[PDB]
Amino acid sequence: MDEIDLRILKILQYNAKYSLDEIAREIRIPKATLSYRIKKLEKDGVIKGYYAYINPASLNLDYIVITSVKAKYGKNYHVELGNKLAQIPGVWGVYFVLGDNDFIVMARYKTREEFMEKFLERVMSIPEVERTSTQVVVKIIKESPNIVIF
Amino acid sequence: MDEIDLRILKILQYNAKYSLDEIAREIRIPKATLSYRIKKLEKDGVIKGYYAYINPASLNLDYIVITSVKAKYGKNYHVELGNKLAQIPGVWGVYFVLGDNDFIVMARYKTREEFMEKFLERVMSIPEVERTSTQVVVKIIKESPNIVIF
Amino acid sequence: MDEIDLRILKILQYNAKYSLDEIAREIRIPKATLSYRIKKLEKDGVIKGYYAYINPASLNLDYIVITSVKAKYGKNYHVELGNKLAQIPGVWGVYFVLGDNDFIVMARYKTREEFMEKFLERVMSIPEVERTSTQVVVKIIKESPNIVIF
Amino acid sequence: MDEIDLRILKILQYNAKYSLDEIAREIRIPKATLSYRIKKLEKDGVIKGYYAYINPASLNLDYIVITSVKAKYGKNYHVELGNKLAQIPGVWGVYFVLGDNDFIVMARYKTREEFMEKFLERVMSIPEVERTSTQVVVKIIKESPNIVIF
Amino acid sequence: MDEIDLRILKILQYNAKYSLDEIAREIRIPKATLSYRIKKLEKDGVIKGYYAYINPASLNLDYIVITSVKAKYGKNYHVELGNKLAQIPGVWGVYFVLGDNDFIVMARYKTREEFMEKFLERVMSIPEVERTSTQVVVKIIKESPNIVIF
Amino acid sequence: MDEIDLRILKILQYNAKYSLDEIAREIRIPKATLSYRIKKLEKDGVIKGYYAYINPASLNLDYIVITSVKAKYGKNYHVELGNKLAQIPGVWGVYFVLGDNDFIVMARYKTREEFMEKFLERVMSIPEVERTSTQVVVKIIKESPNIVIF
Amino acid sequence: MDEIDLRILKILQYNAKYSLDEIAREIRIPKATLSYRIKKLEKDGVIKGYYAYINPASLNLDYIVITSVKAKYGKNYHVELGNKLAQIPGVWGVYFVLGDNDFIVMARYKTREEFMEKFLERVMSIPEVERTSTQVVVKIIKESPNIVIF
Amino acid sequence: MDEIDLRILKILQYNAKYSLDEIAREIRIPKATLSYRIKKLEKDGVIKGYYAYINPASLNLDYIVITSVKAKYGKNYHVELGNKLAQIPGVWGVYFVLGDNDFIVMARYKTREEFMEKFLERVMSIPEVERTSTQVVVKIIKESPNIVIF
Ligand SMILES: [Mg+2]
Ligand SMILES: [Mg+2]
Ligand SMILES: [Mg+2]
Ligand SMILES: [Mg+2]
Ligand SMILES: [Mg+2]
Ligand SMILES: [Mg+2]
Ligand SMILES: [Mg+2]
Ligand SMILES: [Mg+2]
């Protein structure tokens, strides 16, 4: 893609509901050309889709947690554990990272009780788990994963 | 909000581009009523906006990191540090968590070089930082922060 | 309950032996009404009971310890371990906490010898224990678990 | 004190509201003698007082925390910090322990918000604090500090 | 024992080769009485024996190490491990300590090679060992275990 | 020195009170030659002296501790701290070790109170101390620093 | 070897392509004598060989890592693990160290992907591995293992 | 460069003293062409130079260490510390790594004494050092930094 695509994405990452006319005027290109470029970005897998940004508080998601999960070595324990973690309701992020050489799991729940029942108790029952450390998020300074172009 | 709003949000969290007709049919309610409910959710701050989901790889964001930053105690060092972290280009998430009682910073860069120049070198220059630990994400098992209703 | 119940509890948490007359005068309500309110709090499970506060030193409880116990993952090891810990003579507090994601055990003994025989040796024999760390309390700055209303 | 005093304390630690007659019958001694012995225990500082046991949940104390606080060395930082910690509303226990060679603080709050405002923010402002680690209690297996005679 | 015994021990802890006459004069008591008191201390198990203090360097004991050894929980692993550690040639001290809740082993060897062959390789072969951490002593500021009376 | 000196030291390390005749017979050499060799070892600094081995329990030394002390970097803080540690009454061993790159301090006290007053409180007042960790020895499996020849 | 050999090695460690004449002049000795001394050093195993120093960047070796690998205790797990680590393509250094009492592995790869496929995934499949921690090298301040004479 | 250059480098990384004829025969290309390609690699900075591989033991380099050094945050402490570390005699490798987010220093000395005098004492005097951890290498399983093509 080119610089024009980047300018388009820079806008769509923040507000996908801006009419074509508005965007066409901002970047200075024919509306039909804008539409074409957008359709091409979607087809090329650049734009994966469009989502509504919902306020977690509105859904009473008050118990936010980030958990480190260490896996037992051998067989295929690591890859398997990653998959089991990602299937847990409430879990939106699962990453394997170097340094701690383990999984970092991002999740959201309405209450401590839900967290315990849906997440912790389930993870505690997984035998290939060596250790876990749950950091309770008590403050979200910033959370805009949608912003990929600064 | 009610159960109907929840069903609507459950759809919009995945695809905000579904025509009203389609959604109206799925949930079984008048199109005008659907439109009204959606407009009300936006006005009540439930739906904060609509974003395009862009594939990080398409932008060559190959260097993904999660960093723990500990702050010096006293004065207003903690709150201040949180703000400085959130302003760094590439940083999309900043949280203060219990357990490690520190900040967890999510960021994305194209290369090691960019990470060093834009993030690490900047953080290294902040005196109220006591310690930092950067975990290099080498595998994204799952990352769907948009999914708030499972 | 109401504000009056709170004022009553604020007194009973410190001294349950204050005559009804005295309390009735302090909060300014009929003695019969005070008695009724207290009886209602006990019946509603707010007031669980009344205890004598005994000075641990008077019983030569000189060896005070706080131990972190990590459990093996899988099966029902975690819940089971918690129960085994709480049954040990001398143990008055057992909590499962996030962060270290393990159990914190509060106990009191007369001497190192008793601690070893009654607590440590018993815990050491439990196979589902992964690690333990005993912090020896050498100074009790404050310990008033009875104070719930500040 | 003697064995009889111990039997008396073993009862009073659980229920201080048992009439003298009842206790007199259980331990087999004259009521007047029981009353005398109890009065003597109070005078000798063995029985410090009588408290009502209030159910924390009844007061919505849902955010329970245990925090480790490390102090800077030198001057009188350690002793001073201990005192500052014990004065924080919600804090019921403060201990200095060996091993981690730091303070362990027990506290209770109604919500995350109260915890942050009353405890964490206050501690964060104390300059002689080197590090803190807050363990969020998500399960109280046992908490009977009143039981000193097993 | 009394104050006189203490004065005698204070001398014998440093130099057991001081003639009776000399000690008798220093503490001001009959020589026969001194001899008697010393014989009594040996008989009562206070004085366990007399040793020559040999300079480790004279024996080329250049590789001094302090190792922490963690044991697996369950069965009698802990007590057993302690015994196995104490039997290793070169090991002069074995302690079980709280805090790290493990064994601390003091040993001396002539070279890295001897340390590896006699100690490390042997410990590495013990299955009930969970972890070990060997601290290499590069400086002996003080080592006078014989001094028990300051 | 030679093999004969080693055999002599192997005996003196355990019992310095064995008459010359006895040792002369065991190793098979003239008594006068034994005496000469011993005198030479003392003169050459091999045998530093002779001590009485006193049972710590006999002196009620019930509070045994091993503490790790980390020093601030810069100036001459490290060397200085080592000296301050070695001068504390009760401290018999002070070592600087690699790995943790800090000081390990061995000490003995009669009670927790003495430990606090004589050791901990003093160390807490030293500003160049960065961290300390005191391991409470609850079991002495072996402690024979006098044995240098196995 | 002597001082002259050392001067020769001091040169060869930096540049093995200096003609004999040049070296002969610098150190002031007959060329034939220089050649002889060099041949003798090679024969005595002092000079193991001559290598070309290749710039890692020229080969796109952009992913540099240093990993700590802990081994399970018992049997011959430790020695065996060391050998398995050293056989992994990309691994140039494997050391067993005290302190962490584990293996430190130095390796180089072109990309994160290669690192994952050739190193991490392979190590993850080894059952006798207890833990691993990979430090991502983001800056090579100095790397001149060839310099042995300063 | 091409595949032929790679084959040439694969040989030169192990033995830079192979005559041109030998290499020319192995890879199957004109000797003059081989010479040209090698000269081009040197000119393009691919081949930085040629070194003699000296056996560390031959120089009595028996004390091998790997040290982690943490730097204070702020100003230019980090970059500056890296430079100071790399200038220490005996230090051949200095890297800044993520995970521990600190410096890893590789060094070699003949004895503990030299290590202390040349390295440790010098580092201890640097005020911007927050912590250090020296791992003593007691076994070199593999060390072939020259091998860049496997
Ligand atoms: Mg989005
Ligand atoms: Mg979204
Ligand atoms: Mg109470
Ligand atoms: Mg009570
Ligand atoms: Mg002795
Ligand atoms: Mg001795
Ligand atoms: Mg070389
Ligand atoms: Mg080379």
CB contact under 8 A, H54 and G47: yes
CB contact under 8 A, D100 and E99: yes
Alpha helices in chain G (DSSP H): 3-12, 20-27, 31-43, 77-86, 112-114, 121-124
Contacts of D68 in chain E (CB under 8 A): none
Give the integer Cα–Cα distance in Å for G41 and G32. 14
CB contact under 8 A, E101 and C133: yes
Amino acid letter for position F97: V
Which residues have beta carbons under 5 A from ligand 8 (an ion)?
G 51, 146; H 51, 146
The resolution, in Å, is 2.0
Task: Among D101, D102, D103, D129, pick the best mutation site for testing chain F contact (most F Cβ within 10 A).
Answer: D101
CA distance A136 to chain D (A): 8
Give the integer Cα–Cα distance in Å for G119 and A85. 24
- Dihedrals phi, psi of E110, to nearest 5 degrees: -75, -40
What is the distance in A from the centroid of ligand 2 to the CA of A52? 6
| Both structure tokens of A136 | 């309770």
DSSP states along H6-64: HHHHHHHTT-TTS-HHHHHHHHTS-HHHHHHHHHHHHHTTSEEEEEEEE-GGGGT--EE
E44: Cβ contacts below 8 Å, ≥ 6 apart: E1, F58
| Both structure tokens of E72 | 């697996």
Q: First-to-last CA distance in chain G? A: 17
Q: Which domains does chain H possess?
A: 1-52 (1.10.10.10), 53-150 (3.30.70.920)
Give the integer Cα–Cα distance in Å for B54 and A9. 8
Q: What is the torsion angle, in degrees rounded to the nearest 10, for the CA atoms of residue C8, residue C11, residue C16 and residue C21? A: -70
Give the integer Cα–Cα distance in Å for D10 and C149. 27
All chains having 3 or more CB pairs closer than 8 angstroms to chain F: C, D, E, G, H
Helix, strand, coil percent content, chain F, rounded in steps of 5 = 40, 30, 30
G108: nearest CA in chain H? H148
Contact D106, D92 (CB under 8 A): yes
Give the integer Cα–Cα distance in Å for G45 and H59. 11
Residue owning tokens 């067993």: G96
* D99 Rama sector, left if φ>0, alpha if ψ -120 to 50, beta otherwise: left
C75: Cβ contacts below 8 Å, ≥ 6 apart: A125, A127
Contacts of E135 in chain F (CB under 8 A): 97-100, 104
Method: X-ray
Residue E83's CB is within 10 A of a number of other CB atoms, namely 11
- B118: Cα within 13 Å, side-chain hemisphere: 19
- Dihedrals phi, psi of H50, to nearest 5 degrees: -130, 135
**Cα–Cα distance list, B86 to B82, B83, B96 (Å):** 6, 5, 12
What is the distance in A from the centroid of ligand 8 to the CA of G146? 6
H149: Cβ contacts below 8 Å, ≥ 6 apart: G54, G59, H6, H9, H10, H13
CA distance D104 to chain E (A): 14
- Dihedrals phi, psi of G140, to nearest 5 degrees: -105, 100
Instruction: Tell me which residue in B124, B130, B133 faces H99 most closely, judged by beta carbons.
Output: B133
Contacts of B123 in chain H (CB under 8 A): 73
Task: Among H65, H125, H126, H130, pick the best mutation site for testing chain F contact (most F Cβ within 10 A).
Answer: H125
CB contact under 8 A, H98 and A98: yes
A47: nearest CA in chain B? B54
Contacts of A77 in chain G (CB under 8 A): 124
Residue environment code for E109-130, b if the CB has 16+ CB neighbours within 10 A, otherwise e:
beebebbbebbbebbbebebbb
Alpha helices in B1-150 (DSSP H): 3-12, 20-27, 31-43, 77-86, 112-114, 121-124
H68: nearest CA in chain F? F99
- Dihedrals phi, psi of F114, to nearest 5 degrees: -65, -45
DSSP states along chain E: --HHHHHHHHHHTT-TTS-HHHHHHHHTS-HHHHHHHHHHHHHTTSEEEEEEEE-GGGGT--EEEEEEEEE--STTHHHHHHHHHHTSTTEEEEEEETTTTEEEEEEEESSHHHIIIIIIHHHHT-TTEEEEEEEEEEEEEEE-TT----
Instruction: For chain E, say whether H140 makes contact (Cβ under 8 Å).
Output: no
Contact E141, F82 (CB under 8 A): yes
3-state DSSP call for residue H84? helix
Give the integer Cα–Cα distance in Å for C86 and F53. 43
All chains having 3 or more CB pairs closer than 8 angstroms to chain C: A, B, D, E, F
Residue owning tokens 């099966």: C75
Residue H42's CB is within 10 A of a number of other CB atoms, namely 15
Residue environment code for B68-77, b if the CB has 16+ CB neighbours within 10 A, otherwise e:
bbbbbbeeeb
Q: First-to-last CA distance in chain C? A: 17
CB contact under 8 A, E101 and C131: yes
Contacts of H130 in chain F (CB under 8 A): 73
| Both structure tokens of F77 | 């803080």
- Beta strand ranges found along C21-150 (DSSP E): 47-54, 63-71, 91-97, 102-109, 129-143
Which residues have beta carbons under 5 A from ligand 3 (an ion)?
C 51, 146; D 51, 146
Which residues have beta carbons under 5 A from ligand 4 (an ion)?
C 51, 146; D 51, 146
Q: Judged by CB atoms within 8 Å, which residues 96-115 of E form the interface with D?
A: 98-100
CB contact under 8 A, B98 and C99: yes
Residue owning tokens 């554990």: A81
| Both structure tokens of A63 | 């118990």
Closest of A43, A44, A27, A24 to residue A35, by C-alpha: A24
Closest of C112, D78, E78, E63 to residue F65, by C-alpha: C112
As a residue count, chain D comes to: 150
- Can you name the residues that pair with F105 across neighbouring β-strands? F67, F94
**Cα–Cα distance list, D20 to C54, D8, D28 (Å):** 18, 10, 11
CB contact under 8 A, D135 and C98: yes
CA distance A68 to chain H (A): 14
Closest of H144, E116, C66 to residue G51, by C-alpha: H144
Closest of D87, D66, D70, D82 to residue D134, by C-alpha: D66
Instruction: Tell me which residue in A51, A89, A139 faces B146 most closely, judged by beta carbons.
Output: A51
Contact G65, G93 (CB under 8 A): no
CB contact under 8 A, D125 and B101: no
- Dihedrals phi, psi of G73, to nearest 5 degrees: -90, 160
CB contact under 8 A, H129 and F73: yes
As a residue count, chain H comes to: 150
Residue environment code for B23-61, b if the CB has 16+ CB neighbours within 10 A, otherwise e:
bbeebebeeeebeebbeebeeeebbeebbbbbebebbeb
D35: Cβ contacts below 8 Å, ≥ 6 apart: D20
Instruction: Verify F-G touch: 3 or more CB pairs within 8 A.
Output: yes
CA distance F59 to chain D (A): 23
Give the integer Cα–Cα distance in Å for C137 and H22. 75
All chains having 3 or more CB pairs closer than 8 angstroms to chain E: C, D, F, G, H
D97: nearest CA in chain C? C137
Closest of E19, E56, E34 to residue E143, by C-alpha: E56
Q: First-to-last CA distance in chain F? A: 17
Contact G10, G149 (CB under 8 A): yes
Amino acid letter for position B36: Y
- Can you name the residues that pair with F66 across neighbouring β-strands? F106, F135
Give the integer Cα–Cα distance in Å for F44 and F1. 10
What is the distance in A from the centroid of ligand 2 to the CA of B145? 7
**Cα–Cα distance list, D148 to B9, B122, C107, C115, D97 (Å):** 55, 55, 10, 14, 20
Give the integer Cα–Cα distance in Å for C53 and D16. 9
| Cβ pairs E/F, distance under 8 A | 214
Contact H129, H123 (CB under 8 A): yes
Contacts of B112 in chain G (CB under 8 A): 62, 138
Instruction: For chain F, say whether D131 makes contact (Cβ under 8 Å).
Output: no
Instruction: For chain A, say whether G131 makes contact (Cβ under 8 Å).
Output: yes
CB contact under 8 A, F139 and E48: no
CB contact under 8 A, G100 and F98: no
What is the distance in A from the centroid of ligand 1 to the CA of B86? 18
CB contact under 8 A, F101 and H136: no
| Both structure tokens of D9 | 């304390």
Helix, strand, coil percent content, chain C, rounded in steps of 5 = 40, 30, 30
C110: Cβ contacts below 8 Å, ≥ 6 apart: C59, C60, C61, C62, C63
CB contact under 8 A, H73 and B127: yes
Instruction: For chain H, say whether G86 makes contact (Cβ under 8 Å).
Output: yes
DSSP states along D74-131: STTHHHHHHHHHHTSTTEEEEEEETTTTEEEEEEEESSHHHIIIIIIHHHHT-TTEEE
